[PDB]
């Protein structure tokens, strides 16, 4: 009984509605997915057949983390309904960068660090997001915490090659553009380099396939040499030349990160 357990508010985007849990007035986001549009299906520990997005969310939603957590889900005749956390006030990182332009490196460092920790969490839980981008990152403006959203393109993490992809093409790596093949972790690192450039320059570096495979990063904003080096390393054309998550977080540019509360008070409040 979802119609009686939740009060449904207005649309948040698309089909996600704002909502409130009647049991305790908890703010939630209510996401509806049509069964006809689900291409990837999984099985729960109980054997129940659910969309892969439910499988992945359940795997990452235990304990605290930088992911919007799944609180509950329901099956309807023609759809699935997902009950998600809804922090407030929030702004997604795409709108944040649009409104504020290129971010100061101290702020980009704090944001990038939190995304790395969130992505490490997903990978530790066996989940590959496959659509890391500023549109899929929410900023809790009061707490200075970033939260990953939209696992609808994700997959179980594996060490073998992926040959399917439905994420955002301008964040996808050249091995996908060229050969329709990629490995999970090195593809994630590429999208993270795209995201870091986006933060410190105010928009993504590549729009066309030829730019993605070209291997040339032009900086349209003043960016420190240390930050440029990290970006260019993440955007190595050869996947095996890209850094691991450990090498990213040990990079000199990543040191002395702000705490979330410091980030909020200095840059968001």
């Amino acid at each position: 009984p979802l119609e009686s357990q939740y009060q449904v508010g207005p649309l948040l985007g698309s089909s996600v509605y704002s909502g409130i849990r009647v049991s305790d007035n908890l703010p939630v986001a209510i996401k509806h997915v049509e069964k006809d549009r689900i291409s990837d299906w999984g099985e729960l520990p109980n054997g129940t057949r659910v969309p892969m997005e439910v499988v992945l969310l359940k795997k990452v939603s235990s304990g605290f983390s930088g992911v919007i957590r799944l609180l509950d889900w329901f099956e309807r005749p023609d759809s699935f309904v997902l009950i998600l956390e809804r922090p407030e006030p929030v702004q997604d990182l795409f709108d944040f960068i649009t409104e504020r332009g290129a971010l100061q490196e101290e702020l980009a460092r704090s944001f990038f660090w939190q995304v790395l920790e969130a992505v490490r969490h997903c990978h530790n839980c066996g989940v590959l997001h496959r659509d890391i981008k500023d549109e899929n990152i929410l900023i809790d403006l009061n707490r200075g915490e970033l939260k990953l959203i939209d696992f609808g393109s994700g997959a179980l993490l594996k060490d073998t090659v992926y040959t399917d992809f439905d994420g955002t093409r301008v964040y996808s790596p050249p091995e996908w553009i060229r050969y329709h093949r990629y490995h999970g972790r090195s593809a994630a690192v590429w999208s993270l380099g795209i995201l870091l450039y986006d933060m410190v320059c105010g928009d993504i570096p590549f729009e066309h396939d030829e730019e993605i495979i070209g291997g040339q990063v032009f900086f349209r904003q003043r960016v420190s040499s240390e930050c440029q080096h990290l970006i260019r390393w993440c955007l190595a054309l050869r996947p095996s030349d890209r850094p691991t998550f450990e090498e990213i977080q040990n990079h000199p540019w990543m040191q002395d990160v702000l705490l979330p509360q410091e980030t909020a008070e200095i840059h968001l409040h």
Binding site: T98, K133, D150, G152, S153, D166, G167, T168, Y171, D203
Partner: peptide, 8 residues
């Protein structure tokens, strides 16, 4: 310069 979202 035009900045835009990109659908998945």
């Amino acid at each position: 310069r035009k900045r835009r979202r990109h659908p998945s």
